[PDB]
Design a protein around this ligand. Sequence first.
Ligand SMILES: Cc1cc2nc3c(=O)[nH]c(=O)nc-3n(C[C@H](O)[C@H](O)[C@H](O)COP(=O)(O)OP(=O)(O)OC[C@H]3O[C@@H](n4cnc5c(N)ncnc54)[C@H](O)[C@@H]3O)c2cc1C
Length: 257
Amino acid sequence: SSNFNQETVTDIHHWTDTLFSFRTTRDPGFRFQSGQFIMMGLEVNGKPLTRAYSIASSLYEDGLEFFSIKVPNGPLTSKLQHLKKGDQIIVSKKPVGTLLYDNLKPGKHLWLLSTGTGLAPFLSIIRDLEVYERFEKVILVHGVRQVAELAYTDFISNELPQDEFLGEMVKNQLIYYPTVTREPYKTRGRLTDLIRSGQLFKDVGLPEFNHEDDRMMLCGSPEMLAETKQILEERGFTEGSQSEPGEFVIEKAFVEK
Ligand SMILES: Cc1cc2nc3c(=O)[nH]c(=O)nc-3n(C[C@H](O)[C@H](O)[C@H](O)COP(=O)(O)OP(=O)(O)OC[C@H]3O[C@@H](n4cnc5c(N)ncnc54)[C@H](O)[C@@H]3O)c2cc1C
């Protein structure tokens, strides 16, 4: 240890039997940029049992928040699902990640495309002042299999526009687009199918991707990333990085083990 900060679990909310969210304290010395991730976990036998976790809380918040998977035989999330108020976790002290504004060229639009727990880095980004100073529109798209998997669906639409520090920017600039595949819902299908059929652009009121105006952030499943990366690169969009900004950056929501 001592490369970690000890934080106390303050709140827990389970969404389904596979998806929960818990908030913790935040160390005064802990500083991070929106879209980054850290190594988060538990102290087991005096050794760090951690996995990669996007930071889902805003930088303006006095605390940290994590949007987590619950896997039955998973080394971390089998113990982590049984967290309670007062429990201790460890968080690494060196943030890292590709989902940075500076890896993207200046633009008029920012498309945050996520499936499942890939919403988590964008929960930090949409609750940041600077994204709304740099992009005219922020379109958040969240793809899930079931309606119950739409974590934070009421906080984004009902409570986030009411924010006394960020609300008017959310009302005017944030577009939220939830889609569900395997249950009846107002929107249906994969987000990749929605980009193909052109329905994504019909539903949000904005024109198709073009190399001048649209910048994109992708965080989701391996199938969704490779598929959408082919969509974007065959259209002429290039992948940015710290040393060479571009139009889209990508981050793995998980890796199949
Ligand atoms: C950059 C990065 C950021 C990440 N951010 C988050 C985050 O914010 N929240 C989070 O819950 N996980 C996140 N992950 C995934 C993280 O590794 C999982 O917490 C971890 O794999 C599951 O813990 P485990 O040890 O119990 O299971 P593991 O032994 O690591 O994996 C068990 C199984 O669960 C699957 N799995 C893992 N994570 C997910 C997921 N999110 N959705 C669906 N299936 C999954 C794996 O494919 C595997 O088959 C991130 C991964 C990376 C690389």
